[PDB]
Design a protein around this ligand. Structure first.
Ligand SMILES: Nc1ncnc2c1ncn2[C@@H]1O[C@H](COP(=O)(O)OP(=O)(O)OC[C@H]2O[C@@H](O)[C@H](O)[C@@H]2O)[C@@H](O)[C@H]1O
Ligand SMILES: Nc1ncnc2c1ncn2[C@@H]1O[C@H](COP(=O)(O)OP(=O)(O)OC[C@H]2O[C@@H](O)[C@H](O)[C@@H]2O)[C@@H](O)[C@H]1O
Lengths: 157, 165, 165, 156
């Protein structure tokens, strides 16, 4: 059904734990595991939906960035639906790679071919404009999670 | 949704070997995509991307001057994109060109490539390069090694027919 | 289906990965050739050549020490000969070894090869060398690129089934 | 049903993957995580514990805390402990020697003298629970098939 992409250190114990509880209550079966691997690519291609959980340090990991590039690639050629969650990060900081998010991104770019960099850069610009859920704009995390889990469930029908 | 999509540098092969290959196809009931049949009024680059996505097989007819055309390189990058994500089968024809000469974009082929990179971001440029890196390692048909081109075409059309599953 | 001939260096893989591979085959109804089932009193090398000639597919499981054994190279030379003259399908598995280390007769694999060549007519040496050259350019399965070997085995056993139809 | 304790770097990609496929074919559902307390509860609640021992198992104090908890549950609860000696000899486990022992003493340097010996007693004890030694088996595939059937049978 769904492939969540996240930076575990930011969200594993906190918001991500609750999200996975929402899914199971609703019967949604998520897939949980610069390297990526051919098996990880295969799992992304075989997911109808991909949830992009963006966080302060998501761009500090080139594994998380390679996942983003594949999801956007699967959005284009396959019919993959991409849903975005902006967790204590502003979408414009993502589109323009600024704030602390940007400081982490440019560090993941030090000593990197200019061609990898912009494949990532292009992906962040694009994903930042996919309508999603911004935590700062929501009344409480619990209601936000419940809204996301119902939307994903509906889309899976 | 088409049967086979040929990628070629027409100035090198359009009038000659491509014509015979397509005559073999029609003889055997194979349905190629013919760019000359794009309805006038339409944007050409959008019809090519859509035609690639819909091709079960893609025939990349590589030639000495293939990389002089950004049309030919943009197509190759799209085909490799469809090979990985879709189930597209990619078949290669090396027409009077050496496989490693394309892989490293050196020799006479390379001088043609580096010229087409002028006024292009280094990232688009290398999106072409990886496509050339990858496609150069797909085992295919080398024209220089054949004694009679007509028989080669018959061998190619038979391989395509069998693969059409 | 049935006929498959596995070529492997037993010390590297017999007890481990090879055992799992053969278990996948039987699960899917594939009937491989088991050297351990040669009739006793027979001559091993004559039973091996006959078994290769009779296999639709050959699985070459390459490993660091594959070239340390002239049994593994003599079989490889016979496999390539049967691919050319018969229709034998040759599938490659690179097990914790790099394809160019096989192609360039180098790395730890190469030093194991160069010792097995000592005291051999120059004719044995290059019959083996080209076989390594040839098999190294056949697209196959690289173990290092896989994180869960069990899934790799499942992918291999499924491809063999398909190819047999 | 079953709690496997392992040093991922040694066995994740190889033997453990085949074991886990064997279990699933037989309908056994192991507990996979992806020091502790939620983990202790999961061990406390596992009918069987499979100790997959490897050379570097003792290089991780996280793996050693798991062994001490498993042995604790064998004693007070009814936990069945299944042992797998993977390219390591049980007596090297019993006496903490070889490369296995060399990793243990490094995991013990700069470590409380009290942790060390509860670990030692656990290794000494687990090394004497009859299990499956890889060196003694004819092919890894048949061994795994034997283990999954014994675990399956015991689960009834
Ligand atoms: N609207 C048009 N725009 C451009 N060229 C046009 C147009 N209409 C007709 N043409 C003709 O097409 C010619 C270019 O044809 P080629 O030189 O054969 O093409 P090339 O640049 O080598 O690559 C063309 C590409 O088209 C695809 O169908 C094919 O796979 C190949 O990659 C032009 O010189 C022109 O005569
Ligand atoms: N005549 C014999 N009778 C019984 N056992 C024998 C005999 N000759 C050898 N063996 C046994 O075979 C062992 C060597 O087997 P491997 O380590 O697998 O040897 P390797 O050189 O890797 O041979 C692998 C080769 O066998 C072929 O079936 C296969 O295609 C591959 O090329 C020896 O230790 C020995 O026990």
């Amino acid at each position: 059904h769904v492939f969540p992409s996240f930076h575990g250190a930011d969200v594993r114990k906190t918001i991500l734990s609750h999200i996975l509880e929402s899914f199971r209550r609703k019967g949604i079966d998520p897939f949980i595991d610069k390297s990526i691997g051919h098996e990880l690519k295969e799992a992304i291609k075989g997911s109808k939906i991909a949830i992009v959980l963006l966080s302060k340090n998501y761009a500090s990991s080139s594994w998380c960035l390679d996942e983003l590039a594949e999801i956007m690639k699967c959005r284009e050629l396959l019919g993959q639906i991409v849903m975005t969650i902006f967790y204590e990060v502003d979408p414009t900081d993502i589109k323009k790679q600024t704030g602390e998010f940007g400081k982490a991104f440019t560090k993941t770019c030090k000593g990197k071919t200019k061609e990898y960099v912009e494949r990532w850069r292009k992906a962040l610009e694009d994903v930042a404009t996919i309508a999603g859920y911004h935590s700062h704009k929501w009344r409480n995390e619990a209601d936000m999670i419940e809204k996301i889990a119902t939307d994903v469930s509906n889309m899976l029908n």
